[PDB]
C-alpha cells in the first residue's frame, strides 16, 4: 500500500495541473466575458444618449425655422417688404429686397467705423410696361446706384413706400 | 493547531453554503426562462392552426370555383356551337383560337379576325367557300360593338 | 463534530439536488428551443403557400371574370347566378342589347324557360311585347338540343 499510495500521489499531481490550468484558462474567460458585456452596455448607453441629442436638435431647429418663415410672412404683411437672401463677398454683405421694386443693399464696414449702405435696384425680371409704370411713380434717381449713411436708411425706405 | 484546523473546516463550510445559495438563484431564474417559452410555443400553435384553416378554406373555394367555371364553359360551348380553345398575350394584344371554321381573334378597344386553315382537306375548304364569303377568308378589323354581329353572320352561314 | 457533519452534509445534499435540477431544467428547456424553431419554419412555409394561394384563386376567379366579361361583350348574354333546389338547377339570365330577364331550369335531360319581370317600367314591358313573340314570356319546355335555337330566336328579336 506504500507503493500504491505513491503512485496515486503522482497521478493526483498530474491531473490537478491539467484540470486546474484548464480551469484557470476557463475562469479567465468567465471574468473576461463579464467585462466584455460590461463595456458594450456602457457603449450602448452613450449611443442612445447621442441619439436623443440629435432628435432634440432636429425638433428645435425645425421649430425655430417655423418662426423664421412666420416672421418673414408678418413683415411682408406689415411692412410691404421682404428680404430674400444674404451674401458676404469679401468686403460687404448684401441683401436682395422686394418692396413692386426689387433692389439690393450693401453694407460698408471699417473706415470711419460707421456703416454705409449702397443702393442699386435690380429688375432681373421685368416687363417694359411695368418699367414705365414704375418710372412714373418713382423719382428717376432711385434706380441709379446711391450711397448714404445708415442713419438715413429708414428715411429712404419711407420715400419708396410713399411713392408705391 | 487543532485551533486552525477548526477554522478551516468552518471557512470551507461557509463558502460552500454560499455556493449552494448561488446555485438556488440559477434554478429560480430557469423556471421563468422556461415558462415564458411555453407561452410563445402556444401562440405559434394558435397561429399555425389558424394558418392551416386559411389554406384548407382557400383550397375548397378554389376547387369550388373551378368546377363552376368548367360547368359554365361546357354549357356555353354546347348551347353555342362555338368553343374557345386557348389564350396568349404576346406583348400587345391577347388572342383566342376559336372553333366548321377555325379562326383567331385578337384584342388590342378594337378587334381583329384572321382565318385559320393551317390544316384542311381541300374538299372542305371548297365546301366552306360555298357557304361563306371571300372577305371572311381575309383578316379584318372592327370595333368590339360589332362583334356579336359578326358571330351571328358566321352562324347563319354555317 | 456531529454539527459540522450535519452541516456539510445538508450542504452537499442541497448541492446534488440543485445540480440534478439544473441538469434536468437545462434539457427540458433546450428541447423547447427546438420545437419553437420547427413551429417557426412551418409558419414561414404556410405564409408563402397562402400568399401564392391567393393569386391563383383570384386570377382564376378574375380570369373567369375575363371569360365572363368576354361572353358579355360577345353574346349579349350574362348569367347572374345558380341554385339547386332539390330537383333541378337554375340560372338567372339577362340577354339583349343595352333587355329580357329570365331563368332556365334543368331537370334524358330537359329544360324550362320562364320570364322574369318581377320589376319593370310598363313602358318597357310594352316596348318588349312589340319586339317579342307573345309566347316567350309564358313558361315553356324543350329538350336541350333546342336550346341554342331558342337563344338565337331571342337575340334576333332584340
Amino acid at each position: 500500500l506504500t507503493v500504491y499510495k505513491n503512485s496515486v500521489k503522482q497521478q493526483i499531481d498530474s491531473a490537478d495541473l491539467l484540470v486546474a490550468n484548464l480551469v484557470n484558462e476557463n475562469f479567465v474567460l468567465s471574468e473576461k466575458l463579464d467585462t466584455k458585456a460590461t463595456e458594450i452596455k456602457q457603449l450602448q448607453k452613450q449611443i442612445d444618449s447621442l441619439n436623443a441629442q440629435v432628435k432634440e436638435l432636429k425638433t428645435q431647429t425645425s421649430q425655430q425655422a417655423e418662426n423664421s418663415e412666420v416672421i418673414k410672412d408678418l413683415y411682408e404683411y406689415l411692412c410691404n417688404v421682404r428680404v430674400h437672401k444674404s451674401y458676404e463677398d469679401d468686403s460687404g454683405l448684401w441683401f436682395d429686397i422686394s418692396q413692386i421694386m426689387d433692389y439690393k443693399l450693401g453694407f460698408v464696414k471699417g473706415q470711419a467705423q460707421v456703416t454705409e449702405v449702397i443702393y442699386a435696384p435690380v429688375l432681373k425680371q421685368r416687363s417694359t410696361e411695368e418699367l414705365y409704370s414704375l418710372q412714373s411713380k418713382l423719382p428717376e434717381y432711385l434706380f441709379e446706384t446711391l450711397s448714404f449713411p445708415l442713419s438715413s436708411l429708414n428715411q429712404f425706405y419711407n420715400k419708396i413706400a410713399k411713392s408705391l | 493547531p487543532l485551533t486552525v484546523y477548526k477554522n478551516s473546516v468552518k471557512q470551507q463550510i461557509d463558502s460552500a453554503d454560499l455556493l449552494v445559495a448561488n446555485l438556488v438563484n440559477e434554478n429560480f431564474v430557469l423556471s421563468e426562462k422556461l415558462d415564458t417559452k411555453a407561452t410563445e410555443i402556444k401562440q405559434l400553435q394558435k397561429q399555425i392552426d389558424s394558418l392551416n384553416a386559411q389554406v384548407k378554406e382557400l383550397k375548397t373555394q378554389t376547387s369550388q370555383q373551378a368546377e363552376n367555371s368548367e360547368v359554365i364553359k361546357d354549357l356555353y360551348e354546347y348551347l353555342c356551337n362555338v368553343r374557345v380553345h386557348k389564350s396568349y398575350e404576346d406583348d400587345s394584344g391577347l388572342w383566342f383560337d376559336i372553333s366548321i371554321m377555325d379562326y383567331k381573334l385578337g384584342f388590342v378597344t378594337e378587334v381583329i379576325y384572321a382565318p385559320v386553315l393551317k390544316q384542311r382537306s381541300t374538299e372542305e375548304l371548297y365546301s366552306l367557300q360555298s357557304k361563306l364569303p371571300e372577305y371572311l377568308f381575309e383578316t379584318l378589323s372592327f370595333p368590339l360593338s360589332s362583334l356579336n354581329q359578326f358571330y351571328n353572320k358566321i352562324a347563319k352561314s354555317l | 463534530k456531529n454539527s459540522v457533519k450535519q452541516q456539510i452534509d445538508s450542504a452537499d445534499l442541497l448541492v446534488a439536488n440543485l445540480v440534478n435540477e439544473n441538469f434536468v431544467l437545462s434539457e427540458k428547456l433546450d428541447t423547447k428551443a427546438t420545437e419553437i424553431k420547427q413551429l417557426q419554419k412551418q409558419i414561414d412555409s404556410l405564409n408563402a403557400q397562402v400568399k401564392e394561394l391567393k393569386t391563383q384563386t383570384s386570377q382564376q376567379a378574375e380570369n373567369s371574370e375575363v371569360i365572363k366579361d368576354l361572353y358579355e361583350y360577345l353574346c349579349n348574354v350574362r348569367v347572374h347566378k345558380s341554385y339547386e333546389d332539390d330537383s333541378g338547377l337554375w340560372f338567372d339570365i339577362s340577354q339583349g342589347t343595352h333587355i329580357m330577364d329570365y331563368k332556365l331550369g334543368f331537370v334524358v335531360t330537359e329544360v324550362i324557360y320562364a320570364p322574369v319581370l318581377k320589376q319593370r317600367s310598363t313602358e318597357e314591358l310594352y316596348s318588349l311585347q312589340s319586339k317579342l313573340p307573345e309566347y316567350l314570356f309564358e313558361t315553356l319546355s324543350f329538350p336541350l338540343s333546342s336550346l341554342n335555337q331558342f337563344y338565337n330566336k331571342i337575340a334576333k328579336s332584340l
Binding site: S30 | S8, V9, Q12, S15, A16, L19, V20, N22, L23 | -
Partner: peptide, 30 residues
C-alpha cells in the same frame, strides 16, 4: 462564477479530508 463556487466548495471538503488523514498520521506517529 459557478465554476469558482464549485471549486471552492470541493476544495473545502478536501481540506477536511486532509485534516482527517492527518489526525491518523499523528496517531501512527504516536
Amino acid at each position: 462564477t459557478l465554476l469558482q463556487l464549485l471549486s471552492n466548495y470541493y476544495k473545502a471538503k478536501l481540506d477536511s479530508e486532509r485534516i482527517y488523514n492527518e489526525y491518523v498520521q499523528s496517531q501512527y506517529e504516536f
